[PDB]
Structure formats: structure tokens, C-alpha cells
Ligand binder design. Structure first.
Ligand code: HEM
Length: 395
């Protein structure tokens, strides 16, 4: 099924996946892809099947041992433990019970209590950044806004020395280029050392603080430490950037909506949820079947890749009436799957929602309107989904 091989990056760059996942959703929501630059695998394409799969982790594992949570798998041939150091264990890629203790030790930084406590500094930062922007001129929003605010946000959380650490997120987050694996492991080396120094420094409220004071994560293997660092870095970086990029693009595509949001900005909390759905910053997550099973009248064999395509689920007509339309006021926006579902569901969702609400808010104080002007580059990927560059002009 070359025709339902949706691991190809063109269709996300060319933004033409819509008809393909619709065919799947109609004829076979679950279906097996026999070969691809990623071997064989199952599409899981409907809303209910993703929620289903994701609610049985003992049976659809997300463990790094089986291969982690992406559509890629480590090797080729590759060199042994002398260079089989590459693969990174991380709690997103851990089964229970290990996952539970690891999540529980970052979770308190994302209590609602702590979002009330973090609102104020975010608002100022957003206000500032947003106030430095040149009305009339054309500039790169990704760079000037979305990277700035998100990697800003990420710095706060770690207690990082104040675009700086976004370097080794675009690095960690290409798996198809043999030649480039060495220079990648290099870069992740750098940050590992850097974050190691930072570890000893704190070791004397940030995620280091909370990780240092946790028996889960105080004694992490070199590999795991790199992997968990990759998680919290990428987790709280790329997804929010791209949502931020997609928002202005989506609204520039759907101005009907923008001028309804302009009229009524009580609709922002929901606007955030409709953009997160529309954009789907991460287009999929992976699981690996743990044993033989019926999934949706399909016989999943033990060990097979199961790809959960949120990007399809977020346009499942069973739940989203007129799905390809951005409907800011859409009353069930909330029930999208851009944060996943179940035990691994985004531990950060609330923080993202803040950043994005606050932005939409002090934007609409300045009565900003963002027009997409110059070049517009989507990320070349089947995993990350959003923009490298998005040039824009203002009201
Ligand atoms: C629009 C913003 C975001 C999106 C779309 C997003 C999406 C996701 C997705 C799809 C997962 C995997 C869920 C699953 O497999 O069931 C996830 C997990 C995670 N996200 Fe996010 N995320 C966002 C923001 C953040 C932020 C701001 C942070 C941290 C600062 C963060 C940290 C994490 C972590 C740590 C995990 C692993 C959680 C676990 O396995 O228990 N994310 N996120």
C-alpha cells in the first residue's frame, strides 16, 4: 500500500494529506502499510481507535526498548555498544510503572495553581516581545515571535541562563540520513555537558530542582539523562512554536474567523483549542504491539508498529462537523487529540494553553492583525508539523 504510505514528508510540506486520511477514515481506519523507509506499520486513523489504543499501554507499548514513540526505529546495521549509545530512554517512551514515577516528578510545575503563579511573568514577556515588533514591515514571525516566546518559556522552567537552546531541539526532534547521525550525537553531547554543569550547580522550583529531588530521576544513566533532557526540551519547545506559527497562518487563511475573534475575544480560550486541533503540531505518535490482538477487525501481530495519526483524528467527522474549516467558536474543540490521550497525555497542555491564550490576548489589546506576506516554509517531516519560516506584516 504505497498509496496509504503517509510517512512521506511531501504531503505535509505540500499540505495535501487531507484527501488521503479521509479515504482511510472512510474505507479502513486501521490498515497495514507493508513497506516504507520505516518498514511495515499500521495506520491508526480514526478518533476512537487512537483513544482506544492509547488507553491500553501494557498492550500497545511506548517503551524505547521496542523502539520509542516515533515512526522511526534505531539501526540499519550500525556499530555495537561502542556506538549503540545513540538510542535515548525517556518517560514518554517508558511503560508503567517506570513512567508513572517519572511523570509525577515534573507534573507539579504544571498544576493550575502554578499557572496562576506563572501567568504574570509570561504576560510581561509576551507584551515586551510583541511590543518590539515593527508595524508595516515584513519579518519572520517564527523567528521574531514564536521561537522567542517558547524558548523564553522553556528557559524560565529550567532556570536556564537567559533563540539559544532551540539549536539542540531542532537537532533532537533526519533519522533517514545515515551521514548526519554522528554530528547529531555531537550536539546532544554539548547540551548533556552543559546540563550536567547546571545539575551540579543546582545540586547544592525549576525542573532540575524537581528532578534533583526525585529518586526517580536523581540517578539517571548517561543515556536516560540525555533522553529525559531531550523530552522536556523538545516537549516544551517545538510544539508551542508551531502552534504559534499555525495560529496566525490559520487565521490569515480563515479571516471570517479572525474578524469574529476581533469582534468577540471572550472566544480566545476556545480559539486556542481550535488552532491546536487544526494545526496538530505533532501529527502522530507511535506504539508497538506487545502481543497478537484484534484492533478494529484487524489482526495486529506482536511487535508491529502502530502509528497513531492525530492529524487524521483531528478531522474525524464522527466528532468534528465540517472538520477542515477553522471554527474558532466550535463547541467541542476541546476533544481534539493534539496532546494525545490517556496516561501519557501531554503533561504540558495547560502551560501551552497559557502561553497561547496570553499571546492571543495582548495581541488583541494592540488590535494586531497579522497578514502572511513573504515566504512560508512548513517543516519537512511526518512527525513535527508546522513552520520553519513564516514572513508577515501587521494591521
Ligand atoms: C501545543 C503544545 C503541545 C502539544 C501539541 C504537545 C503534544 C504532546 C503529545 C502528542 C504528547 C504525547 C502524548 C501521548 O503520546 O499520549 C506529549 C507528551 C508530553 N509533552 Fe507535550 N505537547 C505540548 C506542549 C508541551 C509543553 C509546553 C511541555 C512541557 C513544558 C510538554 C511536555 C510534554 C511531556 C513531558 C510529555 C511526556 C508526558 C508523558 O508521557 O507523561 N508538552 N505532548
Amino acid at each position: 500500500s504505497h498509496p496509504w504510505d503517509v510517512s512521506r514528508s511531501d504531503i505535509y510540506v505540500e499540505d495535501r494529506w487531507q484527501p488521503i486520511f479521509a479515504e482511510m477514515r472512510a474505507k479502513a481506519p486501521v490498515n497495514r502499510v507493508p513497506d516504507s523507509p520505516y518498514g511495515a506499520y499500521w495506520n491508526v486513523a480514526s478518533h476512537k481507535a487512537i483513544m482506544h489504543v492509547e488507553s491500553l499501554p501494557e498492550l500497545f507499548s511506548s517503551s524505547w526498548q521496542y523502539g520509542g514513540i516515533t515512526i522511526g526505529d534505531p539501526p540499519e546495521d550500525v556499530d555495537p555498544q561502542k556506538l549503540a549509545e545513540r538510542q535515548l530512554p525517556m518517560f514518554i517512551a517508558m511503560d508503567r510503572p517506570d513512567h508513572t514515577g517519572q511523570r509525577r516528578t515534573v507534573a507539579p510545575a504544571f498544576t493550575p495553581a502554578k499557572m496562576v503563579e506563572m501567568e504574570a511573568e509570561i504576560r510581561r514577556r509576551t507584551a515586551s516581545v510583541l511590543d518590539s515588533l515593527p508595524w508595516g514591515e515584513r519579518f519572520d514571525w517564527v523567528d521574531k515571535v514564536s521561537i522567542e516566546l517558547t524558548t523564553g518559556m522553556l528557559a524560565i522552567l529550567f532556570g536556564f541562563p537567559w533563540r539559544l537552546l532551540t539549536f539542540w531541539s531542532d537537532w533532537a526532534g533526519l533519522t533517514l540520513a545515515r551521514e548526519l547521525a554522528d554530528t547529531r550525537f555531537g550536539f546532544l553531547g554539548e547540551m548533556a555537558h552543559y546540563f550536567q554543569r547546571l545539575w551540579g550547580a543546582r545540586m547544592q522550583g525549576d525542573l532540575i530542582s524537581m528532578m534533583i529531588h526525585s529518586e526517580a530521576m536523581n540517578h539517571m544513566s548517561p543515556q536516560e539523562f540525555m533522553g529525559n533532557l531531550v523530552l522536556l526540551i523538545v516537549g516544551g519547545n517545538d510544539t508551542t512554536r508551531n502552534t504559534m506559527s499555525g495560529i496566525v497562518h490559520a487565521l490569515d487563511k480563515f479571516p471570517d474567523q479572525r474578524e469574529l475573534l476581533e469582534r468577540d475575544a471572550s472566544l480566545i480560550p476556545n480559539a486556542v483549542q481550535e488552532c491546536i486541533r487544526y494545526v496538530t503540531p505533532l501529527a502522530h505518535m507511535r506504539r508497538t504491539a506487545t502481543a497478537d490482538t484484534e484492533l478494529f477487525g484487524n489482526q495486529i501481530k506482536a511487535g508491529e508498529k502502530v502509528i497513531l495519526w492525530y492529524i487524521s483524528a483531528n478531522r474525524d467527522e464522527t466528532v468534528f462537523e465540517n472538520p477542515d474549516k477553522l471554527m474558532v467558536d466550535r463547541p467541542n474543540a476541546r476533544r481534539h487529540l493534539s496532546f494525545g490521550h490517556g496516561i501519557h497525555r501531554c503533561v504540558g497542555a495547560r502551560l501551552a494553553e497559557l502561553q497561547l491564550r496570553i499571546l492571543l490576548e495582548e495581541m488583541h489589546e494592540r488590535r494586531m492583525r497579522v497578514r502572511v506576506a513573504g515566504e512560508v516554509e512548513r517543516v519537512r517531516a511526518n512527525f513535527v508539523h508546522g513552520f520553519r519560516k513564516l514572513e508577515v506584516e501587521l494591521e
